[PDB]
Design a protein around this ligand. Structure first.
Ligand SMILES: N[C@@H](CCC(=O)N[C@@H](CS)C(=O)NCC(=O)O)C(=O)O
Length: 214
């Protein structure tokens, strides 16, 4: 796959609502990365076109013609532009071909909703730590470690790979090296299920490719 160029304030607008599916992203936004990973994991590279924008020098046509809330990601599909990364990974999973990324088992679904609900707290805990407000990252990763012990039919949050792993991957990807650098803190220390989860995620090529750049 060829990753397309970043569009700036000086870029001409793409067709909007011409029938092509477009995923508007920033190459470094973790929320957008969630959706990009979902696209790749479902083999949708030829179905969903990436439209990367520069958030520091962004095209006015984005807010004006594509997505008024003026954030990434947003998904243009079937004459609607929709936002919210968690909504979007669920939407793509259920409206496009490719392997299903969400289990049918009601108990796994229920646990998944607990974990989706926890994403805000997870980010807040880590950010609190980086900002020196409270050392909450350890407790947050303890929660993750415990969650990984719930289902023993695979190494991922719901046992087998799912949208839940995808939701967390961009954030763990960023928090891990930052905690090591800024707080001299290794999240894998004492957290074997988490260490295994990171190793297994890193074997997923569809995810690794979202760490790529033009
Ligand atoms: N709740 C949104 C968050 C999206 C978001 O905060 N994106 C940021 C980049 S990390 C953004 O587009 N910032 C640009 C701005 O606020 O103007 C989601 O889950 O998709």
């Amino acid at each position: 796959e060829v990753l397309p160029p970043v569009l700036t304030s000086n870029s001409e607008p793409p067709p909007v609502f011409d029938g092509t599916t477009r995923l508007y992203i920033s190459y470094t936004c973790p929320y957008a990365q969630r959706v990009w990973i979902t696209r790749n994991c479902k083999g949708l590279q030829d179905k969903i076109k990436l439209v990367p924008i520069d958030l520091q020098d962004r095209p006015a046509w984005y807010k004006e013609k594509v997505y008024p809330p003026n954030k990434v990601p947003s998904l243009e599909h079937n004459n609607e532009v929709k936002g919210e990364s968690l909504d979007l990974i669920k939407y793509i999973d259920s409206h496009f071909d490719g392997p299903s990324l969400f289990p049918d088992d009601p108990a796994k679904k229920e646990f998944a909703e607990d974990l989706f609900s926890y994403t805000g707290s997870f980010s807040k805990a880590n950010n609190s730590t980086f900002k020196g407000e409270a050392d909450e990252a350890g407790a947050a990763f303890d929660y993750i470690e415990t969650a990984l012990s719930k289902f023993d039919d695979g190494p991922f949050f719901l046992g087998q790979f799912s949208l839940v792993d995808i939701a967390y991957a961009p954030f763990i990807e960023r928090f891990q090296p930052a905690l090591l650098e800024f707080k001299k803190y290794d999240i894998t220390a004492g957290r074997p299920k988490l260490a295994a989860w990171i190793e297994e995620m890193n074997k997923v090529e569809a995810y690794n490719q979202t760490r790529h750049e033009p």
